[PDB]
């Protein structure tokens, strides 16, 4: 039954920079991690946006429109947990 030990954190980031959100979850079975941005499932297929190992979402060449609420969703056949943070690109 999943619990998020460390969700994403609030950040101010620079335009063109690379930032990440990380989401450290435990539970059995191991929680899968999903990202929403502003309520919509993030598209890790824009090529700026990468899902890396260890529950890291990485966003390269940050744009002003990447500002928003980012939510980590940690899911298990038992249940799910949630933790969000606000990112400001400037």
């Amino acid at each position, epitope marked *: 039954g999943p619990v998020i030990r460390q969700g994403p954190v609030n950040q101010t980031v620079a335009v*063109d920079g690379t930032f*990440v959100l990380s989401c450290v979850a435990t539970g059995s079975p191991v929680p899968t991690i999903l990202w929403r941005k502003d309520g919509v499932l993030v598209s890790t297929q824009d090529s700026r946006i*990468k899902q890396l*190992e260890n529950g890291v979402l*990485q966003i390269r*060449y940050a744009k002003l429109g990447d500002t928003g609420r980012y939510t980590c969703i940690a899911s298990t056949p038992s249940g799910e947990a949630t933790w969000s943070a606000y990112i400001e690109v400037q």
Partner: antibody
Amino acid sequence: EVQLVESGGGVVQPGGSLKLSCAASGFTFSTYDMSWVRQTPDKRLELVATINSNGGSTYYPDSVKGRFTSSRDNAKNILYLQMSSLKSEDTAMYYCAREALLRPPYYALDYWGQGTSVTVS
Amino acid sequence: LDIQMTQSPASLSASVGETVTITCGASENIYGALTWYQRKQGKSPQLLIYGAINLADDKSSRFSGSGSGRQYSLKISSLHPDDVATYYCQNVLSTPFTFGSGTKLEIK
């Protein structure tokens, strides 16, 4: 056979200006993000520019932001770095490097040129 | 505010056939987003390890990358004279993509 050849290095005066070129061949240059990395005389390394495959996006760290401009010619397969307002700390070997396509897709540089020397004073 | 990478030792000399560990510490958790480069004298760096733990294509299995959180290791098993180089780690989590200052490996 992947090849990267930097040129355009030399000795310049403080506040001066230089433009480096990197000729690429042996790969589909228009597909790859490219970086410029420099190596100072103390042997430390520093990423100074990245540019994505179509030239649409560029990144520079604070140490060079405002002074360095990266651009590419995808038809002739050349990467450029215009450097201006140069300072003695900019003295370094400059490499152009290819960003690797990987899984997971961590940023990493798989092919590097042999570099071109820049000296400021 | 930028992520510091500290490498140890700064240099070392070891003998042929020895196994040698080089360490890289980050000032915050970097989640395996680390890469290792090898630079031989008068040459440009080459990719060794990506994502902390993945060996690059045409590189010897004598090299292995390990670690997690803030602590990473590059191990060189069965030291060979061609391993003479400076080894560098790089933070590839968030910009600036800072490099450790390098570990120079010599043969006695």
